[PDB]
Scaffold this active site. Structure first.
Site, mmCIF file in Angstrom:
data_model
loop_
_atom_site.group_PDB
_atom_site.id
_atom_site.type_symbol
_atom_site.label_atom_id
_atom_site.label_comp_id
_atom_site.label_asym_id
_atom_site.label_seq_id
_atom_site.Cartn_x
_atom_site.Cartn_y
_atom_site.Cartn_z
ATOM 1 N N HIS A 40 114.656 -38.692 -21.756
ATOM 2 C CA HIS A 40 116.226 -38.281 -21.566
ATOM 3 C C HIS A 40 116.138 -36.547 -21.086
ATOM 4 C CE1 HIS A 40 116.187 -37.009 -25.993
ATOM 5 N NE2 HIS A 40 117.400 -36.350 -25.788
ATOM 6 N N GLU A 52 105.327 -19.414 -26.190
ATOM 7 C CA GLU A 52 106.463 -18.853 -26.643
ATOM 8 C C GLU A 52 106.755 -18.852 -28.033
ATOM 9 O OE1 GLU A 52 108.692 -17.116 -24.866
ATOM 10 O OE2 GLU A 52 109.169 -18.017 -23.232
ATOM 11 N N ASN A 54 109.613 -16.229 -29.469
ATOM 12 C CA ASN A 54 110.961 -15.765 -29.236
ATOM 13 C C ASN A 54 111.475 -16.270 -27.787
ATOM 14 O OD1 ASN A 54 113.336 -14.000 -28.141
ATOM 15 N ND2 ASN A 54 112.915 -12.773 -29.756
ATOM 16 N N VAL A 57 112.570 -13.070 -25.461
ATOM 17 C CA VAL A 57 112.196 -11.840 -25.061
ATOM 18 C C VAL A 57 110.709 -12.230 -24.679
ATOM 19 C CG1 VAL A 57 110.949 -9.678 -25.914
ATOM 20 C CG2 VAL A 57 113.083 -10.553 -27.048
ATOM 21 N N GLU A 62 103.096 -15.266 -22.985
ATOM 22 C CA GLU A 62 103.652 -16.608 -22.364
ATOM 23 C C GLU A 62 102.922 -16.961 -21.054
ATOM 24 O OE1 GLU A 62 105.009 -13.445 -23.187
ATOM 25 O OE2 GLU A 62 106.942 -14.015 -24.392
ATOM 26 N N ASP A 84 111.744 -43.673 -24.473
ATOM 27 C CA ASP A 84 112.244 -42.419 -24.223
ATOM 28 C C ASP A 84 110.925 -41.366 -24.295
ATOM 29 O OD1 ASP A 84 113.756 -40.161 -23.587
ATOM 30 O OD2 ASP A 84 114.477 -39.984 -25.787
ATOM 31 N N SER A 172 116.207 -32.527 -36.796
ATOM 32 C CA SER A 172 116.054 -31.982 -35.627
ATOM 33 C C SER A 172 117.630 -32.192 -35.116
ATOM 34 C CB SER A 172 115.007 -32.741 -34.853
ATOM 35 O OG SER A 172 115.111 -33.875 -34.973
ATOM 36 N N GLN A 174 120.547 -30.857 -31.743
ATOM 37 C CA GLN A 174 120.615 -30.583 -29.977
ATOM 38 C C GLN A 174 119.417 -29.441 -29.562
ATOM 39 O OE1 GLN A 174 123.939 -29.801 -32.521
ATOM 40 N NE2 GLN A 174 124.506 -28.816 -30.321
ATOM 41 N N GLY A 175 118.661 -29.816 -28.614
ATOM 42 C CA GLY A 175 117.931 -28.544 -28.007
ATOM 43 C C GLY A 175 116.120 -28.689 -28.412
ATOM 44 N N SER A 177 115.082 -32.066 -28.566
ATOM 45 C CA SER A 177 114.655 -33.070 -27.664
ATOM 46 C C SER A 177 113.504 -32.918 -27.061
ATOM 47 C CB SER A 177 115.806 -33.615 -26.821
ATOM 48 O OG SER A 177 116.840 -34.390 -27.767
ATOM 49 N N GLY A 178 112.594 -33.829 -27.033
ATOM 50 C CA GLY A 178 111.305 -34.012 -26.157
ATOM 51 C C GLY A 178 110.319 -33.332 -26.874
#
Ligand code: 0KV
Ligand code: CA
Length: 223
Positions: A40, A52, A54, A57, A62, A84, A172, A174-175, A177-178
């Site tokens: 999804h 990562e 933050n 910033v 990274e 999924d 968990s 929204q955000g 996912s995965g």
């Protein structure tokens, strides 16, 4: 993550952020060239962000790498969210270090009651929306299949498990996912779906990664 804590910078070295000009999903690094995520989360234009803390910033550590291809499971059903799962190949191999490391695949499924670590940069509110800058973490047991099915009758397939708290307050959201569900050092789950966030008797639902290990291995060998 609702009800969790700040993980601490680079303490979940396998966590990825999927970015399209903003953070939209999480994912896990399983080798130097492949991330696992949810079907999804699928879109075009994905930049995989590794190392990562933050996400707003540049701090150091990274690695920003374009996805080269995204492979949604052929049997994914966007009504049910059955299968999924998605694999994403990196344009180039990440640099693996202490900050950026890959999570092993399970060799067997986890039992009910196993404690796992879930993490993401999703909403931290059960009601309303508050997105964090830093990665959040949550400890959550895998529930029994009986409890899972009596929470979501007719909606649970054998490729899903429930994890979290029936008492509401921790989940968990929204955000997220995965993102990974890691239990004793392996990746057992992928954040998938639920009903609201941290609502009483409505635990989160996860993709059951142990059912996909061959598929993963087979697909990576051929790509
Ligand atoms: N763990 C939960 N309670 N979830 C439910 C709320 C948010 C979910 C993360 C999200 C992606 O970041 N997954 C969902 O959006 C997958 N999905 C899509 C259709 C509707 C369904 N339910 S509703 O959004 O809560 C759902 O969970 C997981
Ligand atoms: Ca950053």
């Amino acid at each position: 993550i609702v009800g969790g804590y700040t993980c601490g910078a680079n303490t979940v070295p396998y966590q990825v952020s999927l970015n399209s000009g903003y953070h939209f999903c999480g994912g896990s690094l399983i080798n130097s060239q492949w991330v696992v995520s949810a079907a999804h989360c699928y879109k075009s234009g994905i930049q995989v962000r590794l190392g990562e803390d933050n996400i707003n910033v540049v701090e150091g550590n990274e690695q920003f790498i374009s996805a080269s291809k995204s492979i949604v499971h052929p049997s994914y059903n966007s009504n049910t969210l059955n299968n999924d799962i998605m694999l994403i190949k990196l344009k180039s191999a990440a640099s693996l270090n202490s900050r950026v490391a890959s999570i092993s695949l399970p060799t067997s499924c986890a039992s009910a009651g196993t404690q796992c670590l879930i993490s993401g940069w999703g909403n931290t509110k059960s009601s309303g929306t508050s997105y964090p800058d830093v990665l959040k973490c949550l400890k959550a047991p895998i529930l029994s299949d009986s409890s899972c099915k009596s929470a979501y009758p007719g909606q649970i397939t054998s490729n899903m498990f429930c994890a979290g708290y029936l008492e509401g307050g921790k989940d968990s959201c929204q955000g997220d996912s995965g993102g990974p569900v890691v239990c004793s050092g392996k990746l057992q789950g992928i954040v998938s779906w639920g009903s609201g966030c941290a609502q009483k008797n409505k635990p989160g639902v996860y993709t059951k990664v142990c059912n996909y290990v061959s598929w993963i291995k087979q697909t990576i060998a051929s790509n």
